[PDB]
Amino acid sequence: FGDLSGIISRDQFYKMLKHMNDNDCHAVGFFTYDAFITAAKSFPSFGNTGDLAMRKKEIAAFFGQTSHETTGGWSGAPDGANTWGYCYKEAIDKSDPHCDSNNLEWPCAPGKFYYGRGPMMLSWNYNYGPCGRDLGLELLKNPDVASSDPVIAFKTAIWFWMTPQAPKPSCHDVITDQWEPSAADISAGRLPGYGVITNIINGGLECAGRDVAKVQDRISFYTRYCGMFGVDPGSNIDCDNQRPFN
Ligand SMILES: [Cl-]
Ligand SMILES: [Cl-]
Ligand SMILES: [Cl-]
Ligand SMILES: [Cl-]
Ligand SMILES: [Cl-]
Ligand SMILES: [Cl-]
Ligand SMILES: [Cl-]
Ligand SMILES: [Cl-]
């Protein structure tokens, strides 16, 4: 129980991530199926909640979102932009420390930068802190471990997926039909669906029509992957008519 090898095979993993080992990509040989499988064993509920179709849809949504975060695709890329997931393992621009001091719980270590790392492009002291505590890693003091070890990389992404950050539910709860939207969520058009997941991850900079291009890219990866798993993507897939969470 908690081994996802029966739900997603090695062959499906590398077909999804068709171009991640290409010359045009940057984390060649870094993200492996073995690493993903190992990481997932640490979050037993992930990919093991609901019936077969639900389990597959969770994996499709997780890869849809992380593919976008790490994408190196472009219009006219070989086999389509939605085949270029996992091309990066961290932010290109590493100049910003990403240290937030408002309502500070999580100390920034001097000379350390909390730019995007790993499949979810985990950023900011207020993510590295609780993630490191939950995983037993000193991620604040050494945030580069999240991009030097593929299992750790995946564990940071799955941690993010599984962890609610009020008022946002976990991505896991949304995709497994466990999230009960508040009446504010409903009046805001945040209905359960992949669109809310986009909203959780980066809604402030993308949803309500703020960046249609990025949202469309998230959706293209997701629908491709759903087609490969033979599951239905569902409704409320877009977030252009949703207010961001805050
Ligand atoms: Cl699991
Ligand atoms: Cl492998
Ligand atoms: Cl596409
Ligand atoms: Cl650093
Ligand atoms: Cl949008
Ligand atoms: Cl289905
Ligand atoms: Cl559908
Ligand atoms: Cl919407």
State the CATH number of the domain containing residue 135: 3.30.20.10
Identify the nearest ligand to the CA of 219 by its number: 3
Q: Is the dihedral of CA 194, 198, 199, 205 positive or negative?
A: negative
Instruction: State in Å: Cα 235 to ligand 7 middle.
Output: 6
Q: How far is the CA of 201 from the centre of ligand 3 (A)?
A: 20
Listed residues 115, 130, 148: the one ending a domain: 148
Q: Is 108:114 a contact under the CB 8 Å cutoff?
A: yes
Where does residue 93 rank: exposed (0-12), middle (13-18), buried (19+ CB within 10 A)? exposed
Residues 37 and 106 in one domain: no
Residues 6+ apart with CB under 8 A from 85: 16, 17, 20, 63, 66, 67, 68, 70, 71, 73, 221
Residues 26 and 135 in one domain: no
How far apart CA 182 and CA 189 sit, in angstroms, is: 11
Question: Do residues 128 and 27 both lie within one domain?
Answer: no
Answer yes or no: do 214 and 118 share one domain.
no
Residues 6+ apart with CB under 8 A from 23: none
19 and 53 inside one domain: yes
Q: Tell me which H or E stretch contains 201.
A: helix 194-206
Cα 118 to middle of ligand 4, angstroms? 14
Domain that holds residue 98: 90-148
Looking at the fold, whether 75 and 172 belong to one and the same domain comes out as: yes
- Copy the structure tokens of residue 166: 């009020």
Do residues 151 and 40 lie in contact, with contact meaning Cβ atoms separated by under 8 Å? no
User: Is 166 in the same domain as 122?
Assistant: no
Q: Supply angle C-alpha 2, 157, 26, rounded to 5.
A: 120
Which ligand neighbours the alpha carbon of 162 most closely? 1
- The first and second tokens of residue 188, run together, are 């805001």
Domain closes at, from 148, 165, 196: 148
Residues with CB under 5 A from ligand 8 (ion): 189, 239, 241-242
Q: What is the resolution of this structure in A?
A: 1.7
Comparing CA positions, the residue from 174, 158, 170 lying closest to residue 40 is 158
Both tokens assigned to 98: 């990403």
Clarify whether 69 is annotated catalytic: yes
Q: Ligand nearest 21 Cα, by number?
A: 2
- The reply to whether 174 and 161 lie within a common domain is yes
Strand ranges (DSSP E) for the chain? none
C-alpha 49, offset from chain centre: 18
160 shares a domain with 49: yes
Same domain flag for 102 and 5? no
Q: Among 123, 148, 173, identify where a domain stops.
A: 148
Annotated catalytic residue, options 58, 69, 90, 206:
69
* Residue owning tokens 């609901």: 50
Q: Around Cβ 145, how many Cβ atoms within 10 Å?
A: 17
**Residue 95 corresponds to which tokens in the numbers above?**
């100049």
225 and 128, same structural domain? no
Number of domain units in the chain: 2
Q: Which two structure tokens, joined as six digits, stand for 231?
A: 């599951």
| Same domain as 143, residue 154 | no
CA-to-CA distance for 239 and 203, rounded, in angstroms?
Answer: 8
Rg (CA), the chain: 17
CA of 241 to the centre of ligand 8 (A): 3
Q: What spacing in Å lies between the alpha carbon of 232 and ligand 6's midpoint? A: 4
The DSSP 8-state label assigned to residue 143 in this structure reads G
Q: Residue 64 is encoded by which pair of tokens?
A: 């849809």
Output the CA torsion sign for 118, 93, 165, 63.
negative
Q: How was this structure determined?
A: X-ray
